[PDB]
Design a protein around this ligand. Structure first.
Ligand SMILES: CCCCCCCCCCCCCCCCCC(=O)OC[C@H](COP(=O)([O-])OCC(O)COP(=O)([O-])OC[C@@H](COC(=O)CCCCCCCCCCCCCCCCC)OC(=O)CCCCCCCCCCCCCCCCC)OC(=O)CCCCCCCCCCCCCCCCC
Ligand SMILES: CCCCCCCCCCCCCCCCCC(=O)OC[C@H](COP(=O)([O-])OCC[N+](C)(C)C)OC(=O)CCCCCCCCCCCCCCCCC
Ligand SMILES: CCCCCCCC/C=C\CCCCCCCC(=O)OC[C@H](O)COP(=O)(O)OC[C@H](N)C(=O)O
Ligand SMILES: [Zn+2]
Lengths: 265, 116, 297, 205, 57, 196, 60, 88, 106
């Protein structure tokens, strides 16, 4: 929003700033004579709305760890501008706690922030004002570079045979594997060390050092990216579509008492 | 001509696709350590996802991200292009880990210039 | 010819050819040259190479780093938990100590992550400059080709050489799976169980050298630890031939067969399935079991 | 093994493990491999003559369920490519899928042998019938699953929903004054935070 | 309750498995080929505008 | 020179903002061990950690000694196509018999109660929080969309909105042609009136 | 808290703060008490008595 | 800017309560994208006064003896601070 | 041909780009693996090492063995005692051999 700065020096009737604004833009006699029309309510926190949203809340306001979080400095903004903030926050925190109390060894937590939004135009992914130098280390990398190419069409464009594109010689050799193991007297050859793409699993999670070896606990922060122009979400293995529709219905049913007394005009 | 090509075998009915929570799409960019990676789709990894134009993404490095447009899990990650100062003093024969150890220690602790 | 809009390297379009056309004489020469081959079901290979214990597929040095950091963190816990003062009853003091412990562990977890990142950066450097870490003739074959584009033999040689260029504590090799090695070697499981029992007894003695309430709490913890360690090494350790012989329920025998099939698929399957065939009169199954014990096991 | 016609995936897997090691299937697979092996692979295998080598078949041949599915899909052929491989068209998901059955001769041989071992007819329709019998009857097993305990999230949601039935303060509070009166009192009785003196009312400047 | 139906659970709209569109490699592509792929090859949008260009020329 | 930074450790800048720690954001000023280690005090947790650490050391030593000093009786070399880096995974993620179906159904029920509904509620909160962040005159929230929006598929939209619109446009075209010709010339097929 | 162009007020409570039953509690340490006396090798004598107060007094 | 933290007015004769505070305002113009407004009603605080008011509402509405708090001017109104939760 | 005029494959769209017969050569291949289109009519010569230049400011960054392995020649007249080694195309390693005579272009 806006930070008024020093309220004291701007409340005076006659000010250098007001006269400069009159001369150049932003102020005029219409404000000195008719403040109720051109200043009116002004822009600022709405104490009455904050009180209403606070007193409409359930006991969730007591059981939420919000006031100790680093975002506690935004309490009034979110209480005023996010009806039903405390109940939703309590559900969010209890969801995190129940994921934490799971029986799975890896606890995945969804993370959504300003970067979680995709875009077809590259200038929309930068912070404003844009940095002086952008894409210094090359441009984007497309995930599609890791998909198998259209072999048939590629052969066809060049006027090559491409008859046996799907028929390949079998390969059974010890020279083709670098990862060798001995498992109960059996020497198993399987796989080749590729490099940075073979260690994605460990580099993505952080261990709980106090958890024993027979009951490991790992914490993983799964980032989420969405288009925001799609209207349909497909979480994959993390959340089934039927469960998501159920959650939508329940969320819209519970968060209705906080929304029904207001009009959108 | 591609949309009417056949699958090769019945594996796709049993295996785990490329882009699963256990078999993600790992991709590699170049840059500075910790810098967010720019990645993207060409669109239409799903029937309900747009396909008109490429859709870009900004993601933290070395973390499991999920596109909830298509449902694909990916591992954009960064590899820094640290290379010998190209002034003619590059080594012509196999080099060992000592001098490289010193240079890498200095780069990690303080950083190195950019080839611009 | 007065212009030249070339690129660094033209793109490469694969030539497919096909499976070799080996004639009858060549076919016989090949077949006479092969060893005694045993073709294996995909299930066998799956159970051999399944991920059981090394859930995150972390290399050796990463596990060593995590254990070392745990040792260092434990060596510093009493100093951090010493002298804490807070206004409240015993429960409040306990929660304060828990928060102090959490802060300590979160502090130690960041150093471990930093070190993992540094070693990963070293290995990233190894990949980024392969021609400067290789001898002839592999140098040019790493210079002109990417990993997917190399011959299998040259690919393997290049990767092994690049891995061995590093010091022993940076080489990226997967760590051993305790459950796997225990599942495919009966003596190893016996040794692991003996080690678990020895540690349990030693811990019980140490506890018995401690004041009363701590004794009860720690003894409960020791029992839980032994139980879960055994269930971790071999979840099916309770499916013994004595138990199989004592089981006369078809559903229970099916459950046992499923649990063994998940774990290792060993001759205990012969025992369970034989006892199931006898209880149901499956002569075809008995014949198949005879064939299996002759060949499969 | 339980006198149910081997209607169990573990039983089928053990049966196939027996099959692949029998002399006839071993000979067929030896021919197939020897006629379609890389030269490097031949050189590598020939060097392990003393020991025993176990070669796991590729998934589409080493998985009994895949072999039976491909064999039973063969009757639905719609064409044949320039390398002899049949191309089948069926209805699996929401659209007609075309699948190219590679090595259909080997697939058919293995499927016929699997069906022979199980004591069933060695025809592609029999494979479909067997695979459909494997997966049938799951509703009864579903019905006997005991529900799990409610999650901490479920308990919290239940508690909050039970609480809000009574009513929130904004609906259950009685002796609450109108905000306008409170603001007027504030202005008329307390010192302004700018002029440091009591203002009569609200002033813009 | 048929095998295909089960195998069809991952190929319905709700839980369809994602599939990324592929690229191809062209060994040599001059501007003419670019045209042949950029403008030609979209001869439902390029038809009449291209006709107008040709008619004018 | 001002305040030159010392070292080159990570700083949160425009190019990099890091990977958020949601667990610490949520569990702020509240312990985690009452959930990960229920019922245990700090001393018990430390003692258990030490005991398990020693046990794990012993087991690791046993396993390494075993794998490094066992005689090889068989060699397993998987089959792969030429030019392929790694063999195809022999594990299938689809249930085949009914017992696997029941097992996966029980797993799904547990996961739904304990891992999916939490994800759903977290995502719903995230969407509402983004709305709140962009609200208040900062961004364009409420200018379009909402829950009352009428979303139609391609077929429904083209069949019920596009074709009728073009039909009305065509009728307007013909009617306007005739009316305009009459208005200007005063006749329908005879050009100017009282002239020809 | 920490960052480039990030609000310095965006900082949580300290590590030595706990929340039990909603109330917040601060955890601290103890300190040594009693009269202590030393002599520097040049001859000066130093006498300190710490009572744990904020205000201190130093006398030559 | 620095003003008093929000308080609670309480009318002893009628036992009628209500929260109150100083809410600044300013002439409306374009906002800022990179700024989420801080706590301007209770400055330099984590905004706990909403929780304290929620907890104190039951006590205040039930009925409280306001003889232990300062009066406002010469009227029947008293100020109760919200720096801490009210239990009485 | 428009395609060949504008530096394309030409009539056959599967064709390459370089035509070393009329001066359209591959600089990258020449710099890395030498001009292998002159391979039929040129031959390497095989047998003064480079160790004499081991103390110079820019060549001192190399090891002594590396400079010892390199054998030099005047680069003007054929050494009558030097044998000839056939230049093998499709071989990326022969241009980097240490057995062939070289010339000090420093
Ligand atoms: C956008 C423009 C796209 C079209 C032009 C592309 C480049 C043309 C070739 C070229 O530049 O060769 C460089 C040429 C040397 O080329 P090269 O690679 O050594 O060998 C020739 C090729 O192998 C190619 O040799 P070629 O065997 O393909 O023969 C060239 C071919 C194509 O030539 C033309 O199209 C010439 C068009 C001009 C009018 C005359 C022909 C009609 O010529 C003909 O078929 C007709 C020959 C003349 C007949 C005259 C009587 C009728 O050098 C010069 O010409 C130097 C002067 C600068 C030329 C222009 C440079 C590009 C700037 C834009 C030019 C736009 C105007 C049209 C070009 C001619 C000037 C009016
Ligand atoms: C008919 C006109 C076609 C377009 C113009 C020609 C062109 O782009 O040539 C590119 C080509 C080179 O483009 P290129 O780099 O794409 O071709 C090389 C392709 N590979 C990398 C595969 C080898 O230029 C020439 O052949 C000579 C210059 C022609 C352009 C002259 C300036 C025109 C300015 C107005 C447009
Ligand atoms: C298809 C895409 C859009 C097409 C454009 C449509 C848009 C509408 C706009 C324009 C319509 C079409 C544009 C093309 C314009 C066509 C008009 C044109 O060349 O006459 C041809 C000319 O009379 C013929 O004269 P000719 O030389 O035979 O005889 C003379 C003499 N006696 C002589 O000695 O020979
Ligand atoms: Zn996508």
């Amino acid at each position: 929003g806006t930070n008024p700065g020093d309220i004291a020096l701007n409340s005076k009737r006659f000010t250098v700033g007001k006269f400069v604004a009159w001369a150049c833009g932003g102020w005029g006699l219409k404000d000195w004579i008719f403040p109720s029309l051109f200043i009116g309510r002004g822009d600022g926190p709405d104490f009455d709305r904050i009180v209403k949203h606070t007193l409409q809340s359930s006991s969730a306001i007591e059981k939420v760890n919000w006031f100790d979080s680093p975002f506690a400095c935004y309490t009034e903004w979110f209480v005023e501008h996010f009806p039903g903030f405390f109940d939703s926050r309590y559900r969010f925190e209890m969801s995190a706690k129940t994921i934490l109390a799971n029986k799975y060894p890896i606890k995945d937590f969804p993370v959504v922030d300003m970067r979680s939004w995709r875009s077809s135009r590259l200038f929309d992914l930068f912070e404003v004002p844009h940095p002086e130098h952008t894409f210094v280390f090359g441009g984007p990398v497309l995930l599609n570079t890791e998909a198998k190419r259209a072999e048939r069409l590629e052969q066809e464009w060049h006027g090559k045979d491409g008859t046996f594109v799907d028929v390949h010689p079998l390969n059974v050799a010890t020279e083709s594997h670098t990862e060798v193991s001995v498992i109960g007297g059996i020497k198993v050859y399987n796989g080749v060390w590729q490099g940075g793409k073979d260690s994605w699993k460990r580099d993505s999670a952080k261990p709980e050092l106090t958890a024993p070896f027979h009951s490991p606990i790992w914490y993983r922060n799964m980032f989420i990216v969405k288009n925001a122009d799609q209207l349909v979400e497909h979480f994959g293995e993390n959340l089934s579509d039927e469960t998501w529709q159920e959650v939508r219905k329940e969320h819209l049913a519970f968060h209705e008492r906080f929304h029904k007394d207001y009009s959108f005009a | 001509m591609y949309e009417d090509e056949p699958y090769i075998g019945v594996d796709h009915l049993y295996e785990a696709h490329k882009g699963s929570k256990e078999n993600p799409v790992v991709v590699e960019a170049i840059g500075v350590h910790g810098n967010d990676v720019f990645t993207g789709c060409l669109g239409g990894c799903h029937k309900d996802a747009a396909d008109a134009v490429a859709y870009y993404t900004i993601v933290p490095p070395n973390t499991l991200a999920v596109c909830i447009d298509c449902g694909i899990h990916f591992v954009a990650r960064i590899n820094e292009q640290l290379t010998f100062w190209p002034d003619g003093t590059q080594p012509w024969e196999k080099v060992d880990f000592k001098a490289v150890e010193g240079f890498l220690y200095k780069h990690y602790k303080y950083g190195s210039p950019l080839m611009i | 010819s007065a212009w030249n809009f070339q690129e660094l390297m033209e793109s490469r379009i694969p030539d497919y050819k096909g499976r070799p056309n080996r004639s009858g004489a060549e076919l016989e020469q090949v077949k006479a040259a092969l060893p005694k081959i045993e073709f294996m079901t995909s299930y066998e290979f799956d159970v051999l190479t399944k991920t059981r214990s090394n859930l995150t597929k972390e290399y050796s040095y990463q596990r060593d780093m995590r254990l070392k950091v745990t040792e260092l963190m434990l060596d510093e816990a009493p100093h951090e938990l010493e002298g804490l003062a807070v206004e409240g009853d015993a429960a409040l003091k306990q929660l304060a100590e828990l928060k102090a412990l959490q802060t300590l562990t979160e502090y130690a977890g960041d150093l471990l992550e930093g070190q993992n990142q540094i070693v990963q950066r070293v290995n990233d450097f190894v990949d980024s400059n392969p021609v400067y870490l290789l001898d002839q003739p592999l140098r040019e074959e790493a210079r002109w080709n990417l990993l997917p584009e190399m011959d299998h033999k040259t690919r393997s040689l290049v990767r092994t050489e690049l891995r061995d260029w590093l010091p022993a504590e940076y080489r990226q090799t997967r760590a051993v799976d305790l459950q796997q090695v225990a599942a495919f070697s009966p003596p190893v499981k016996a040794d692991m169980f003996r080690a678990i029992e020895a540690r349990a007894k030693d811990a019980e003695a140490e506890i018995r050298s401690l004041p009363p309430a701590e004794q009860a709490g720690l003894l409960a913890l020791v029992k839980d630890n032994v139980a879960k360690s055994k269930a971790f090494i071999d979840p099916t350790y309770d499916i013994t031939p004595e138990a199989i012989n004592a089981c006369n329920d078809v559903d229970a025998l099916r459950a046992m067969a499923h649990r063994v099939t998940e774990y290792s698929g060993d001759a205990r399957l012969l025992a369970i399935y034989g006892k199931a065939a006898q209880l149901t009169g499956d002569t075809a199954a008995q014949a198949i079991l005879k064939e299996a014990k002759d060949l499969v096991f | 093994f339980f006198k149910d016609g081997f209607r169990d995936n573990a039983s089928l897997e053990l049966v196939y493990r027996v099959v692949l090691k029998s002399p006839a299937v071993s000979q067929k697979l030896i021919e197939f491999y020897a006629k379609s092996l890389d030269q490097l692979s031949v050189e590598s295998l020939s060097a392990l003559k003393g020991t025993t080598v176990g070669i796991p078949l590729q998934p589409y041949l080493g998985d009994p369920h895949r072999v039976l599915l491909a064999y039973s899909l063969l009757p639905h052929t719609v064409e044949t490519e320039a390398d002899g491989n049949p191309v089948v068209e069926t209805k699996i998901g929401d659209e007609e899928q075309k699948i190219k059955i590679i090595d259909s001769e080997v697939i058919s041989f293995l499927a016929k042998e699997i069906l022979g071992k199980l004591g069933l007819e060695t025809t592609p329709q029999a494979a479909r019938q067997y695979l459909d019998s494997l997966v049938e009857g799951a509703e009864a097993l579903y019905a006997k699953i005991a529900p799990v305990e409610p999650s901490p999230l479920e308990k919290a949601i239940a508690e909050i929903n039970e609480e809000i039935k009574s009513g929130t303060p904004w609906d259950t509070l009685k002796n609450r004054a109108d905000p306008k009166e409170l603001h007027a009192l504030k202005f008329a009785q307390l010192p302004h935070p700018i002029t440091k003196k009591v203002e009569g009312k609200f002033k813009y400047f | 309750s048929t095998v295909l139906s089960i195998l069809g659970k991952r190929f319905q709209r709700s839980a369809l498995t994602p599939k990324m569109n592929p690229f191809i490699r062209i060994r040599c592509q001059g501007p003419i080929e670019e045209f042949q792929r950029g403008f030609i090859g979209e001869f439902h949008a390029f038809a009449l505008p291209g006709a107008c260009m040709l008619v004018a020329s | 020179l001002g305040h030159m930074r010392v070292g080159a450790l990570w700083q949160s800048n425009a190019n990099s903002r890091g990977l958020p720690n949601l667990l610490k954001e949520v569990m702020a000023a509240e312990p985690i061990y009452p959930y990960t280690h229920p019922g245990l005090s700090a001393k018990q947790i430390l003692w258990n950690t030490k005991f398990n650490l020693k046990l794990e050391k012993d087991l690791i030593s046993i396993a390494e000694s075993a794998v490094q000093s066992q005689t090889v009786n068989k060699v397993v070399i998987p089959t792969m196509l030429t030019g392929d880096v790694n063999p195809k995974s022999p594990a299938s993620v689809v249930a085949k018999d009914k017992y696997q179906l029941a097992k996966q159904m029980a797993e799904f029920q547990y996961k739904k109660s304990y891992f999916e509904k939490p994800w759903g509620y977290m995502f719903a909160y995230y969407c509402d929080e983004d709305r709140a962040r962009l609200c208040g005159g900062i961004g364009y929230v409420g200018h379009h969309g909402g829950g009352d929006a009428e979303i139609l598929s391609y077929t429904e939209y083209v069949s019920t909105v596009v074709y009728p619109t073009i039909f009305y446009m065509a009728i307007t075209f013909v009617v306007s042609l005739f009316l305009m010709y009459y208005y200007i010339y005063g006749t329908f097929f005879s050009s100017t009136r009282n002239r020809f | 808290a920490l960052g480039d162009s990030i609000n310095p007020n965006q900082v949580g409570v300290g590590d030595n703060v706990i929340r039990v039953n909603g109330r917040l509690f601060e955890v601290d340490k103890v300190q040594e008490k009693g009269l202590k006396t030393s002599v520097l090798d040049n001859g000066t004598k130093v006498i300190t008595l710490d009572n744990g107060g904020s205000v201190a007094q130093l006398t030559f | 800017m620095n003003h008093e933290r929000p308080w609670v007015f309480l009318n002893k004769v009628t036992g009628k309560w209500g929260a109150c505070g100083w809410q600044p305002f300013w002439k409306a113009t374009s906002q800022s994208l990179n700024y989420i407004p801080d706590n301007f009603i209770a400055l330099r605080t984590n905004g706990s006064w909403v929780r304290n008011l929620w907890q104190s509402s039951k006590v205040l509405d039930r009925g409280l003896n306001a003889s232990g708090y300062p009066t406002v001017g010469t009227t029947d109104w008293v100020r109760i601070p919200l720096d801490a939760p009210l239990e009485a | 041909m428009l395609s060949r005029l504008l530096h394309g494959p030409g009539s056959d769209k599967g064709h390459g780009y370089f035509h070393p017969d009329h001066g359209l050569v591959d600089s990258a291949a020449q710099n890395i693996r030498g001009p292998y289109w002159h391979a039929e009519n040129m031959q390497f010569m095989q047998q003064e090492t480079a160790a004499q230049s081991s103390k110079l400011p820019v060549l001192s960054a190399q090891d002594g063995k590396t400079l010892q392995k390199i054998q030099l020649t005047d680069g003007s007249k054929v050494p009558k005692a030097a044998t000839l080694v056939k230049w093998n195309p499709k071989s990326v390693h022969q241009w980097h051999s240490d057995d062939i005579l070289r010339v000090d272009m420093t």
